[PDB]
Design a protein around this nucleic acid. Structure first.
Ligand SMILES: [Mg+2]
Ligand SMILES: [Mg+2]
Ligand SMILES: [Mg+2]
Ligand SMILES: [Mg+2]
Ligand SMILES: [Mg+2]
Lengths: 13, 29, 134, 29, 48, 99, 49, 44, 99, 74
RNA sequence: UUCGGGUCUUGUAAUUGGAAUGAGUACAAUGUAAAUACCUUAACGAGGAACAAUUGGAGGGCAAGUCUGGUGCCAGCAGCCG
């Protein structure tokens, strides 16, 4: 979950 | 005393570097 | 009636009208008059030779910064001075003043990148597969 | 530092120069 | 991606000095950050 | 290559051996001494010897005698003279330790 | 708060066909027969130059 | 009027080299070596 | 017998100076690379590239590349025509990398 | 007496990223990719695996009570 | 999207066996005006099968390391340099 959240932070940004 | 002088020197160097950078970016465009 | 002749023997008028109207296209005009190359950055060439004048970003503090990868190059063909990228700061060491470079299409205003230096590809040098001949 | 220097006639003149006015010149050997 | 594999080599951790071994493991930035937040959590629950 | 390691240079018409010191700019803030040359990139090197105009390329060899030739490649370093000065201010990180 | 509608002016700028003759000569007459070979051969020549 | 900027630079150099030749052709032989020195190709 | 430079007429208005560089000295390699207008790079086809061949090319590339011509010798030692062609092809392409 | 060039000089590969062996043979690479895909398809949905072998020993992975995989007509 | 949910022979950075073959080398023969090569073929030729496949793209992580800014421990740049 933590890794996936950090990845979406790139997708959102 | 050297503490006071170094801050003065570092301040002078930082201002000069930024001024040089402003010139470079201005020239390129 | 659609505003055009339609008689079975009206071929001449359609042909001559078409040729006159065909010149309206900017694309057609450039193709026939051979002026499609003015807009090209290199004036029709796929690459551009130049002289490395100065490496502007050498004094930058931040490594691999956008400023660091820029070099002013003087196009040999017409003498106009322009600016180009280097792929990375590592390759910047290879490039030096007064040495030939081949430029190709790619901070705004910068539209070129270096692909060869002194007749040798930068990527070839960067992968340590070649030495720059001087 | 060169003590002295002087020019000498060409010991292996090229034919064009010669006719204007032996093909091998190997003094060391 | 103009980075070499050598560009991305791992940098290994050092450890406590042998003379200082009795004082315990040599904490690092990652180790410090855990105890710092836990410390903050107590005072926030203590100040309330 | 190692700092303060003898190295035979070839500058212009002249060949000679010196004791270079390899340094880095440290984000263009200082001239810090390096311990070894970078594995696959350039670095600033300062050495004492006859001056030459900039843009003068040169090559380096650590061994010239045939007795020690071995089989490995004998060309050690390649570079370009960048400045000529009568002074340099290389510095080394000296970190004090307390408990 | 009244904004009248713009009067779209009659074109005084040269029309496209007129622009061809706005130089010393008639631009339509000095053309080539094979524009396809025009572009290809030049591009090779430019890089050879 | 040269087509490319390259030709202009080469023209300037060639013109200058051409000028050097004329002055030396005007020049007396004993003077010439005093000014120019021993040119390349001389056996010395 | 040939010793040292040899100057010979090569045309109506052209002359050449031949100089057999000592193969066993790296110092002699360096200075020749700085004055050699032309290099006749001798290569043993049967054995292949050698250090002295590769070393000299690097010296030439860094001191200003002069004209280089590769000369392959000892090709008669090959006993098969097919293997001779393959060796010639491999050598030529590798030579095309340096030059 | 003769100093021959080593492997590094002859091939002149220079610096290249590490590459797994499967790229050397495309057929092998696709073989491993497919068999990997089959394993995943089992996770996505059940797939027939020859039916019953041996006596019926029950459902090994368990029965779920309130769960239906039923695709309803609306 | 959090909330979590669905599924079962999966993984090993582990050991180990003898069978197969042509890239190449090469007696010979075939091929050819004469040759090279192809198709044949005695004898050699595999475990890192080092007999060492390439060209591009996407994304990490690490230091007693370096640079910059500041509502403390942070953030940005980046990191072949400890
Ligand atoms: Mg109608
Ligand atoms: Mg035609
Ligand atoms: Mg074959
Ligand atoms: Mg090739
Ligand atoms: Mg075969």
């Amino acid at each position: 979950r933590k890794e996936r959240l950090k990845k979406l932070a790139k997708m959102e940004e | 005393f050297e503490a006071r002088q170094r801050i003065e020197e570092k301040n002078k160097e930082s201002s000069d570097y930024h001024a040089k950078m402003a010139h470079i970016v201005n020239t390129i465009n | 009636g659609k505003g055009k002749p339609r008689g079975l023997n009206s071929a001449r008028k359609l042909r001559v009208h078409r040729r006159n109207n065909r010149w309206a296209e900017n694309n057609y005009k450039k193709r026939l008059l051979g002026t499609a190359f003015k807009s090209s950055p290199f004036g029709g060439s796929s690459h551009a030779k130049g002289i490395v004048l100065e490496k502007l970003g050498i004094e930058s503090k931040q490594p691999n910064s956008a400023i660091r990868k820029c070099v002013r190059v003087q196009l040999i063909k017409n003498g106009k001075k322009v600016t180009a990228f280097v792929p990375n700061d590592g390759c910047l060491n290879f490039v030096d003043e007064n040495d030939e470079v081949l430029l190709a299409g790619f901070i705004p205003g910068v539209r070129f990148k270096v692909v060869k230096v002194s007749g040798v590809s930068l990527l070839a040098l960067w992968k340590e597969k070649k030495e720059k001949p001087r | 530092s060169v003590a002295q220097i002087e020019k000498l006639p060409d010991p292996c003149p090229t034919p064009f120069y010669q006719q204007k006015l032996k093909l091998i010149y190997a003094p060391m050997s | 991606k103009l980075v070499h594999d050598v560009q991305k080599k791992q940098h290994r951790e050092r450890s406590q000095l042998t003379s200082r071994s009795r004082y315990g493991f040599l904490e690092k930035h990652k180790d410090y950050v855990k105890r710092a937040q836990d410390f903050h959590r107590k005072q926030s629950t203590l100040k309330v | 290559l190692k700092t303060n390691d003898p190295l035979v240079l070839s500058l212009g018409w002249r060949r000679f051996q010196t004791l270079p010191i390899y340094t880095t700019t440290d984000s263009r803030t200082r001239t810090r001494m390096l311990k070894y040359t970078p594995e696959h990139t350039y670095c600033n090197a300062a050495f004492y010897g006859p001056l030459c105009s900039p843009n003068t390329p040169f090559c380096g060899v650590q061994i010239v005698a045939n007795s020690d030739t071995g089989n490995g490649f004998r060309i050690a370093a390649t570079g370009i003279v960048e400045e000529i000065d009568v002074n340099i201010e290389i510095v080394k990180k000296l970190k004090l330790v307390g408990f | 708060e009244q904004s009248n509608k713009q009067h779209r002016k009659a074109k005084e700028k040269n029309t496209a066909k007129k622009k061809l003759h706005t130089q010393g000569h008639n631009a339509k007459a000095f053309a080539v027969a094979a524009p396809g070979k025009m572009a290809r051969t030049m591009q090779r020549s430019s890089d050879v130059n | 009027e040269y087509d490319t900027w390259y030709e202009l630079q080469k023209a300037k150099i060639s013109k200058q080299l051409e000028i050097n030749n004329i002055e030396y052709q005007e020049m007396t032989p004993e003077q010439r070596q005093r000014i120019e020195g021993f040119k390349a190709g001389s056996y010395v | 017998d040939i010793q040292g430079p040899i100057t010979v007429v090569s045309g109506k208005h052209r002359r050449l100076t031949f100089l057999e560089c000592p193969a066993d000295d790296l110092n002699a390699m360096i200075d020749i690379a700085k004055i050699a207008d032309l290099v006749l790079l001798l290569i043993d086809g049967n054995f292949g590239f050698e250090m002295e061949t590769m070393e000299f090319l690097n010296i030439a590339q860094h001191h200003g590349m002069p004209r280089v011509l590769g000369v392959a010798t000892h090709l008669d030692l090959f006993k098969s025509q097919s293997t001779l062609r393959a060796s010639k092809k491999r050598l030529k392409h590798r030579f095309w990398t340096e030059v | 007496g003769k100093r021959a060039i080593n492997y590094q000089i002859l091939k002149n590969k220079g610096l290249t990223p590490k590459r797994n062996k499967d790229n050397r043979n495309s057929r092998v690479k696709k073989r491993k990719k497919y068999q990997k895909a089959q394993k995943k398809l089992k996770s996505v949905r059940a797939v027939y695996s020859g039916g019953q072998s041996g006596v019926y020993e029950g459902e090994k992975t368990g029965i779920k009570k309130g769960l239906t995989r039923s695709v309803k007509f609306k």
